[PDB]
Design a protein around this ligand. Structure first.
Ligand SMILES: NC(=O)c1ccc[n+]([C@@H]2O[C@H](COP(=O)([O-])OP(=O)(O)OC[C@H]3O[C@@H](n4cnc5c(N)ncnc54)[C@H](OP(=O)(O)O)[C@@H]3O)[C@@H](O)[C@H]2O)c1
Ligand SMILES: NC(=O)c1ccc[n+]([C@@H]2O[C@H](COP(=O)([O-])OP(=O)(O)OC[C@H]3O[C@@H](n4cnc5c(N)ncnc54)[C@H](OP(=O)(O)O)[C@@H]3O)[C@@H](O)[C@H]2O)c1
Lengths: 290, 290
């Protein structure tokens, strides 16, 4: 079993360390706040006093801290200790930060993968969990068996920015859903109905309507927003006007959905009402792709 | 089999009519534009030339036009002809419009249910379809077997505004999800990647993270946004900042999701960063429920 070092013992990093300990790896851990390592150390983890001690302990170093600023602040002084090792950054960040970190790593003989954890901490090391990786295939395949302790391992390309691009796209979908869920519960709440009374029906509706994804992708990829439309944009915008009006009638703030509402009305007025709602992507995608 | 009249033969009204034809009901149809009624007559429907002729053919009349303005313009002149019949309004509208319509119906001896179709036209009469109804239980139970031709029939309350409230709440959830899907595809599109390349991952992610619905509902219903939190709001806001920044750096308009980003920031700056993201509901729900 490959020895592994975890840098960062928040909710996610603690889950990673526990998963490697469960799988029998010699697991070295470090956290800015040392007290977050105490339970892990009692469990058999090697609690390093410094970042450099932690890094020197293992051929594979996994970083999972709050953000890029934390990642940079923590590892920049330890550049020399990372020489010759594999660094897997599971800290959330942008494609730009991943490509800049990759340039730094190539300048200092650090093998580098950028990754995005598509799981919550209790999901780590369960069939729910998968993690996206980008960077050199040699580094990915060398550590794939170790990484698969955490969940499925999906290498999405050699361009180091690609795992974060996919990560952030998935989070983007998720947060739109979350906004919808909050606003849906706010509307039902406005008549004194518990959220739990709506939750089963809402779960089923969102599950079923989550198959719009492939349909929407096909419309976008072909540029055809008109063929086979059964829910036209003019009708959808009329219904959207009513859920906005109903929220206002019931004293609910509907600001979260106003941007989409306004875009859909704009598109109806521009003549696209007989097509599907996905045509709105033409108003937000980057100019060179329109 | 109860004779049925369908008023309004757009994409969804036509699906309703076809379902009753396939189930062997004598199906009378009317549409403002005659061509949609002629098309259904070729499939066995009875094409009524006028609204009153359509209404007088059946003890059960189902309306499915664009909005309540269309419903009122169409049916107000035929008010006396509806006396003694059951009118089921599946036109999208608000709770206030449902209640106003119910008052009109009661004043004129019209049995009235207000409903919301949670299906798309090709889903009618399949296991995917369900329709929410509100109004008197006696009327609902009298026509339930006929209504179940179209999908599951869920009576959600005696107040006629309640079906619309549930309907609009589900649509509210769905449009938040749609905003997330469009923004997600816009992000992946900004690097030249086809939307279809992301579709399987995104479908599975949204399907999975849609089980946050019950967890969110329990957090809202208990008012406890801190117990059992494994993805704290401060961390979620940091990742949200990256998906916003990544979109902007690639020339994507991220305005669809910027309002939620702002509410999460607000709750973090207000000291709720250690709890879950559902605490944002306190900023949007009706004041009397806070
Ligand atoms: N939790 C999830 O559901 C989830 C899911 C997918 C991905 N992730 C990703 O996992 C990463 C960590 O998230 P988490 O849930 O573990 O967050 P968390 O529980 O808030 O932990 C934050 C971690 O970052 C460290 N940190 C913050 N600022 C630092 C600095 N300036 N220098 C050194 N360390 C610093 C903290 O150290 P202290 O303990 O000393 O404060 C702690 O180890 C994030 O990038 C997140 O996007 C999380
Ligand atoms: N996926 C869906 O399609 C879907 C799903 C659930 C619920 N619904 C609901 O179903 C209802 C109808 O939607 P749809 O998809 O069938 O829309 P549609 O295909 O655009 O049809 C609109 C219908 O409204 C009629 N109409 C519009 N203005 C009118 C007026 N002033 N007087 C009389 N009739 C008028 C149209 O008649 P003409 O043909 O003469 O224009 C047509 O019959 C909406 O309230 C919608 O929210 C639709």
């Amino acid at each position: 079993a490959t020895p592994v070092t975890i840098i960062g013992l928040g909710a996610m990093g603690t889950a990673l360390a526990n998963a490697f300990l469960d799988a029998g790896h010699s697991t070295t851990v470090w956290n800015r706040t040392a007290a977050r390592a105490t339970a892990l150390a009692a469990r058999g983890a090697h609690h390093a006093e410094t970042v450099t001690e932690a890094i020197a302990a293992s051929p594979l170093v996994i970083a999972c801290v709050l953000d890029y600023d934390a990642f940079h602040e923590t590892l920049a002084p330890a550049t020399d200790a990372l020489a010759g090792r594999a660094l897997v950054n599971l800290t959330n960040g942008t494609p730009k930060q991943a490509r800049e970190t990759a340039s730094w790593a190539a300048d200092h003989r650090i093998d580098y993968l950028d990754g995005g954890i598509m799981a919550i901490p209790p999901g780590i090391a369960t069939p729910d969990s998968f993690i996206l990786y980008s960077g050199p295939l040699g580094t990915f395949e060398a550590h794939r068996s170790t990484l698969e302790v955490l969940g499925a391992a999906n290498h999405v390309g050699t361009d180091h920015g690609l795992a974060s691009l996919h990560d952030l796209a998935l989070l983007t979908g998720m947060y739109g859903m979350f906004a919808g869920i909050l606003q849906a519960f706010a509307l039902i709440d406005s008549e004194g109905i518990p959220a739990g009374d709506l939750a089963p029906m809402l779960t089923n509706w969102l599950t079923g309507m989550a198959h719009s994804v492939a349909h929407y992708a096909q419309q976008i990829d072909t540029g055809d927003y008109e063929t086979g439309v059964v829910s036209n944009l003019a009708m959808q915008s009329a219904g959207f006007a009513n859920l906005v009006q109903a929220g206002e009638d019931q004293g609910v703030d509907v600001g979260l959905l106003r941007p989409l509402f306004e875009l859909m009305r704009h598109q109806v007025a521009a003549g696209y009402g007989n097509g599907d709602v996905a045509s709105v992507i033409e108003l937000i995608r980057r100019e060179e792709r329109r």
